[PDB]
Design a protein around this nucleic acid. Structure first.
Lengths: 57, 342, 71, 63
DNA sequence: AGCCACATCCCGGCACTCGAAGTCCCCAACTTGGATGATTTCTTCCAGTCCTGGTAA
DNA sequence: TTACCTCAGTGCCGGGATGTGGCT
């Protein structure tokens, strides 16, 4: 069977708040032309936060 | 044809590393350094506006410096030889489509690859790829040495040695005991490219005799302009060594682009060879040599397979009859990519 | 198993695979740019291999075929 | 794929091992000598050949 | 109760010891008194440029 | 075409033999 993933609006928007409030390890991903990708990406100025948990090597 | 068709890449290289030897240890990395410089205020918009309309500044305003931050790399004093090496694997992977949405398209692409194999032709591609390895063009801007030696080992036990690579041309005839090694190498590769279930792996090293403190040119990173003025504007690529230190390197796809520079089939006038591209892109002149308007590009030619197979099947083979259009197409299938919406 | 893990900075430049205009133009444009993250690995794998048939092939030939099959 | 004999003499070729028998047997008695119970046995004449013979056998087996 | 398969078991046989002096015991390991003041830490000007949209009027 | 919109030991080794346990 072929699978196509898609990003959840509700889930990503919550993560942007939790990492800054709970002080989690994170970084930022840039998007050119934020208005062409979506409501949230535009509101965030083209910078979106993600979790960063590398292995202890 | 059909909605979806694609091939993966059949010839893939590694990351090249620069190093040198000492009397105390066999592997010491070449490394990069960072520094502040005083630049110039020059160029347009610095003094002119619009179309040559001087803008209003005072005479002294251009005598000021323009500071910048760059990374750079030099060979340290008293090192007689610099060494560079990489690994190469080749798979016979152009015999079958990665994906295809149409059984009638599929059986035809298969027919063609086989019709070609038995008449000869893989030798032609192998000869061209082999020449580019032994010539040394994959050093790009670092070819300006006082002497270059190239050595190759393979998984089949062979070894090749070019005593001095600085004079081997694209067009011409090589010296004895060099021309011969080109023939032998061609045979190993021509097979690796087309016959499956053969594992082949190569290890290519070279040495550069250099100047007293010669500048070295590794791959450059792609970056954003920093806003800090404490961060370098020109950053160079490095690789982590097994001991934890960093060393200057050349990126895989930069080695790759050099190895596949073999297309001198365009316009019936060889000139210099191009990097194979579906549209014949020419980076130096910022243009394209197989513009769709000419009928010479990959996508027009992809539809003449039925006619080509017919010719290949009717031909005797073993001669010089294979046309430019068939060779071109096979070269593109080797650098596999997405050929959809056909 | 993880023996080495190195993060690489920056991002890849796309091949100029898109014509600036469909017809009567000899200029090539860049499709667009993405922001991703990449690394270099060194790792070992231990695979639990099972053969259904009662008689197995524990031979040098199979070791060569195990080297060839490797993606 | 340092320098102490109990480390270096074993690193050597297995064929050589049989010639270490007397050294091993020596150490053995010493280890007993340094033990709370072995003070009744170490270097006792009665145990000489037994210990040496079994060690020699083991070494040959290792070789 | 009689017949057969498979366990080990003990004598005759075989091979090794192995070159080739010994190198000193025992008991003790320092108390007290102090670590400095007065002064000062730079100034002029500068901080590149260009290429890499999707969608509908 | 264009405009839009983000934080005295020991160790193997052969070979014929004593004795035993299960089936009929």
């Amino acid at each position: 069977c072929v699978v196509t993933p898609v990003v959840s609006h509700a889930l990503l928007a919550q993560l942007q708040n939790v990492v800054h409030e709970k002080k989690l390890q994170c970084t930022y991903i840039h998007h050119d032309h934020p208005a062409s990708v979506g409501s949230l990406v535009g509101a965030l100025g083209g910078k979106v936060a993600v979790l960063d948990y590398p292995p202890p090597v | 044809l059909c909605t979806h068709l694609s091939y993966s890449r059949s010839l893939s290289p590694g990351k090249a590393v620069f190093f040198y030897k000492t009397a105390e240890s066999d592997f010491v990395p070449l490394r990069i350094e960072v520094a502040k410089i005083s630049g110039q205020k020059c160029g347009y918009t610095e003094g002119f506006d619009a179309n040559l309309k001087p803008k209003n500044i005072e005479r002294y305003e251009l005598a000021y410096s323009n500071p910048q931050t760059i990374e750079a790399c030099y060979v340290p004093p008293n090192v007689d030889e610099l060494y560079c090496r990489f690994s190469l694997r080749v798979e016979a992977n152009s015999m079958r489509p990665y994906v295809c949405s149409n059984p009638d398209v599929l059986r035809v692409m298969i027919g063609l690859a086989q019709a070609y194999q038995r008449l000869g032709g893989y030798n032609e591609l192998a000869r061209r790829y082999s020449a580019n390895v032994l010539r040394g063009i994959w050093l790009w801007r670092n070819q300006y040495t006082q002497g270059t030696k190239i050595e190759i080992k393979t998984s089949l036990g062979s070894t090749y040695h070019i005593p001095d690579a600085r004079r081997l041309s694209w067009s011409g005839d090589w010296p004895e005991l060099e021309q011969k090694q080109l023939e032998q190498l061609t045979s190993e590769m021509a097979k690796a490219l087309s016959q499956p279930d053969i594992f082949w792996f190569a290890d290519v090293t070279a040495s550069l005799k250099t100047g007293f403190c010669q500048e070295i040119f590794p791959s450059q990173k792609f970056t954003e302009r920093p806003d800090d003025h404490s961060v370098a504007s020109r950053q160079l690529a490095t690789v982590e060594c097994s001991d934890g230190q960093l060393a200057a390197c050349i990126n895989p796809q930069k080695i790759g682009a050099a190895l596949q520079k073999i297309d001198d089939w365009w316009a019936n006038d060889a000139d210099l060879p191009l990097r194979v591209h579906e549209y014949g892109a020419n980076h130096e002149a910022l243009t394209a040599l197989r513009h769709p308007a000419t009928g010479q590009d990959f996508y027009h030619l992809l539809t003449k397979a039925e006619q080509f197979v017919t010719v290949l099947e009717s031909s005797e083979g073993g001669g010089v009859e294979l046309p430019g259009e068939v060779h071109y197409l096979m070269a593109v299938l080797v650098k596999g990519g997405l050929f959809q919406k056909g | 198993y993880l023996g080495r893990y190195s993060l690489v900075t920056g991002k890849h430049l796309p091949e100029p695979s898109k014509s600036a205009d469909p017809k009567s133009v000899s200029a090539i444009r860049r499709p667009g740019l993405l922001d991703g993250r990449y690394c270099d690995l060194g790792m070992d794998l231990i695979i639990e291999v099972h053969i259904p048939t009662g008689g197995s092939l524990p031979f040098t030939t199979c070791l060569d075929l195990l080297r060839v099959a490797l993606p | 794929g340092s320098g102490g004999l109990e480390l270096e003499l074993i690193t050597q070729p297995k064929k050589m091992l049989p010639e270490l028998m007397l050294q091993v047997a020596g150490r053995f008695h010493l280890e007993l000598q340094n033990h709370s119970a072995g003070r009744r046995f170490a270097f006792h004449p009665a145990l000489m050949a037994p210990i040496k013979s079994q060690i020699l056998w083991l070494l040959r087996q290792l070789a």
